[PDB]
Each structure stands twice: as structure tokens, then as C-alpha cells.
Amino acid sequence: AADWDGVPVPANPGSGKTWELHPLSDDFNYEAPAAGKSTRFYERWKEGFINPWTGPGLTEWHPHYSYVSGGKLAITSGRKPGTNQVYLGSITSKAPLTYPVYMEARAKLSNMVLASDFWFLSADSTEEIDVIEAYGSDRPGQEWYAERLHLSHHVFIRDPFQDYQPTDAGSWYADGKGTKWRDAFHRVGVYWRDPWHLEYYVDGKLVRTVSGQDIIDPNGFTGGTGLSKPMYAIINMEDQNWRSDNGITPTDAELADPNRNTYYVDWVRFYKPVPIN
Ligand code: NA
Ligand code: NA
């Protein structure tokens, strides 16, 4: 049995096709302690990132800030002693995915100004899809962000560095009911259909379609190829520069609070559309 049994895939695989479970899918029903993890953990995952970079902003990704227990992957946070840096969990898939693929997590954001992330990046760091990217903080003055999921993707040129993502209002999704995403587990998925077409789904409903060169890559950073490179699955938290460069970063009191400082993932699952037998 799996934790997602009976929970449908909301995207359309095409006439005459069905969704086939990809083996990277993990519902985290095993024990993998922070130090050393477990055999099952390492069948799919590595600690850290796609490469040795330790992260943006004041982030320093740290292997002992991820663990699997009680049916959940936990990504936690803490102050790096004697510094302003933040130790954060991160895990990355050992193998990448390619379109067409539906990619979904069921997760509870941390109650922090940090980004809680479920996202995808090519080996060369030029192509990115962000499925969960959201900031759970209940701080006074952060209420707008607490009601929003950032639905986005990036294309980069590494040198000289350039970064494009969509920036229209609909890239920050709220349900209109005042839901604070941090308060419960929610499922967020993307159908990465082809290099020019993404569909975002929240709790089983299509909420945004990002389609065509004008929104995927209007500046031509992908040289006409779109979102086409294989991408690794990454589950992390981040202290991001657009926040901490500008005075928003966790306090020691927040980082010390076990009821706020952790981002939980019930499952990640991935499906490929395949012909019906
Ligand atoms: Na490409
Ligand atoms: Na689970």
C-alpha cells in the first residue's frame, strides 16, 4: 500500500494513455535517522544538492538537518553556532526526470520566513521548475505570504549571470478562502508536459497553466529549447537572498522552536504517461 493510494492524478495523460508510477516516488514509510540515514533512503536520494554548493543567502545545507521518521520526510533548520548562517535540510534524487512527467508532493510548510521547497533543477543549473516554493511564517506583517504558494520556474545563463522567471500576479497563488498553507498538509503538483507547457495543481485542482515561449523563456536563455534538460528532484529549505539580503531571515528564537522550524513531506510521487495495454 502507499500513502497516495486512491488520490488521483489530476492531469490528463492523453487519449489512450494512463499514468504509470515512476520508481522515484517515495511515501517515506521508513526510519532514516539524521546521521547515516538508511539503506532505503539511499536507494533514491542523496543528502544535499545536485553539486557541492551549500546554498543561497545565509543557507548552509547540512546532512543532519534531514531525516525520515513517522511516515514523513523532515527538513529542519538551526542556527550555525557563532555565525549568522542557517543550517538547513536538503535531499536530491540520485537520478533525474524528463518530460512528460507529473511531479507532486504532499507537504506541510515550515512556519518560518525560509522557503519550503519541492523543486527541479538541471545538472548544469540552467533550467528549473518550482512546484512547492512558499514561505509559511506566521510573523505579523507576513500574512500575505502565508496565504500564497509561489508557482514558478527559472531559466538561467550562468556567466554572465541572468535569471528569468514569470512575475505576473498569478505566479503567487491564493485560494480566496484565506487558507494559510502552513496549517496543514497540501498537495502541489506540476505536469511538465513538454518544454513549453507546465500545469500547476493544488489539492487536485488545476490552478495555473504556463504555456508558450513568451512566458516560458521570452529572453531566449534556453536557445529555443525550452524546459527540456533532465532535472533532479530537490526537497529543501532555503534562506533566499531576496529575503535575507533585505532583512528577512529567521531569528534564533524561531530556529530553536521545534514547532516552527521544520518542513514535513508526507510523499513525493511522479507519474509518466504511457499507452494503455
Ligand atoms: Na532546454
Ligand atoms: Na508518508
UniProtKB/Swiss-Prot annotation:
Residue positions of the active site: 128, 133
One Gene Ontology term of the molecular function aspect: carbohydrate binding
Superkingdom of source: Bacteria
Entry annotated with the keyword Kinase: no
Keywords: Glycosidase, Hydrolase, Periplasm, Signal
Activity regulation as described: Activity is abolished by Hg(2+), Cu(2+), Pb(2+) and Zn(2+) ions, but is not affected by NaCl up to at least 1.0 M, Mg(2+), K(+) and Ca(2+). Not affected by iodoacetamide, p-chloromercuribenzoate, dithiothreitol, 2-mercaptoethanol, EDTA and sodium dodecyl sulfate. Inhibited by N-bromosuccinimide.
Places the protein is found: Periplasm
Record carries keyword Cell cycle: no
Other information: Recombinant agarase was produced extracellularly using B.subtilis as a host. The protein expressed in B.subtilis was detected as the catalytic domain composed of amino acid residues from 19 to 300, probably due to proteolytic cleavage.
Protein name as it appears in the record: Beta-agarase AgaA
Upper classification of the organism: Bacteria, Pseudomonadati, Pseudomonadota, Gammaproteobacteria, Cellvibrionales
Gene: agaA
Portion of the full-length sequence here: 20 to 296 of 433
